[PDB]
Amino acid sequence: MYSPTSILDIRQGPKEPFRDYVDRFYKTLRAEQASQEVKNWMTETLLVQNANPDCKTILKALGPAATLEEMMTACQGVGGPGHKARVL
Amino acid sequence: MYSPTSILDIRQGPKEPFRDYVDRFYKTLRAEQASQEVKNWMTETLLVQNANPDCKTILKALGPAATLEEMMTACQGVGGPGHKARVL
């Protein structure tokens, strides 16, 4: 097991909001043992890669300079609600 | 285009020798604009990930310490010939 990490296990759902993906991706990263340098690259490469086939298209149109705030916010309405109904 | 690099475009063939994958992966990396820190992580994570469904199994049995020399050499015989016939 060279280093299967766990971030690679993150993937925005087809109809899931990016904000959730970022929150989860950051949640995982915070639990990922790696150099910050990786975060800048990984959080900039695999962040939009494992994204849903929807967020990748829109997020791209934003520009390779868009910030997380811009990505999450601009991705608003892209996916369905993340909190609703839910079973006890 | 955040940064789709090109390394992600590398993937050992189902019956291709790892030595070729490493040579190609290193060939691409040498043409990849990234921090060395990424090489240590990427060349250790995505190196075995994009590998063929064959090399990954064997290479794993070697141990997360197996050096490149150990990976390429030990992967000898796993895949078929890398140079033969070829059309002019």
Features:
homodimer, 88 residues, mainly alpha, Non-ribosomal Peptide Synthetase Peptidyl Carrier Protein, Chain A, 4 helices, globular, viral protein, HIV-1 capsid, C-terminal domain, dimeric, HIV-1 CA C-terminal domain
Description of the molecule:
The structure is a homodimer of 88-residue chains. Chain A has a single domain (1-88), classed as Orthogonal Bundle (Non-ribosomal Peptide Synthetase Peptidyl Carrier Protein, Chain A). In chain A, 47% of the residues lie in helices and 0% in strands. Chain A contains 4 helices and no strands. Chain A is globular, with a radius of gyration of 13 Å. The N and C termini of chain A lie far apart (37 Å). At the A-B interface, helix 2 of A face helix 2 of B.
- What's the gyration radius of chain A in Å? 13 Å
Shape of chain A: globular
User: Which fold name fills CATH's third level, the topology of chain A?
Assistant: Non-ribosomal Peptide Synthetase Peptidyl Carrier Protein, Chain A
Quaternary state of this entry equals homodimer
What's the total count of β strands of chain A? 0
CATH level 1 class label of chain A = Mainly Alpha
Q: Name the helix and strand elements of chain A from N-terminus to C-terminus, one letter apiece.
A: HHHH
CATH superfamily of chain A: Retrovirus capsid C-terminal domain
CATH architecture of chain A: Orthogonal Bundle
Beta-strand content of chain A: under 5%
Given the helix and strand composition of chain A, which structural class is it? Answer: mainly alpha
Distance between the termini of chain A: 37 Å
Q: What is the count of structural domains of chain A?
A: 1
PDB class: viral protein
Keywords: HIV-1 capsid, C-terminal domain, viral protein
Assembly: dimeric
Entry title: A high-resolution NMR structure of the dimeric C-terminal domain of HIV-1 CA
